[PDB]
Amino acid sequence: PLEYNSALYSRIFDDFGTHYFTSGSLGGVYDLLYQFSSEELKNSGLTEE
Amino acid sequence: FYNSTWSYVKHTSTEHTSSSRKRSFRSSSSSSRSYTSHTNEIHKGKSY
Numbered sequence: 001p002l003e004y005n006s007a008l009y010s011r012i013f014d015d016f017g018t019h020y021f022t023s024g025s026l027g028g029v030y031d032l033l034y035q036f037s038s039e040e041l042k043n044s045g046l047t048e049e
Numbered sequence: 050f051y052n053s054t055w056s057y058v059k060h061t062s063t064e065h066t067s068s069s070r071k072r073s074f075r076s077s078s079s080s081s082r083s084y085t086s087h088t089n090e091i092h093k094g095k096s097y
Contacts, residue, residue: 050097057090 001008065082 053094055092061086
């Protein structure tokens with residue numbers, strides 16, 4: 001609309017966003033996390049009478 | 050995961066001996082006993 005209406009104009013930001021890229025970098029991202037844990041109990045009791 | 054393992058031996062041996070003799074006559078008595086109690090236990094629990 002030519003007259004101002006906050007709703008209808010706000011739908012422009014909903015659909016297309018507030019900004020655009022003037023410049024930038026494209027590429028890729030790798031992220032990893034690994035978490036090993038281990039435990040070992042041994043028992044060797046001997047008793048004699 | 051975890052891997053529980055248990056290995057239990059109980060061995061008991063018990064012995065009794067009683068020899069007696071009396072004379073004046075002759076008399077004698079011998080008694081002998083051997084007892085054993087044994088338990089072997091193995092228990093395991095493995096979970097993943």
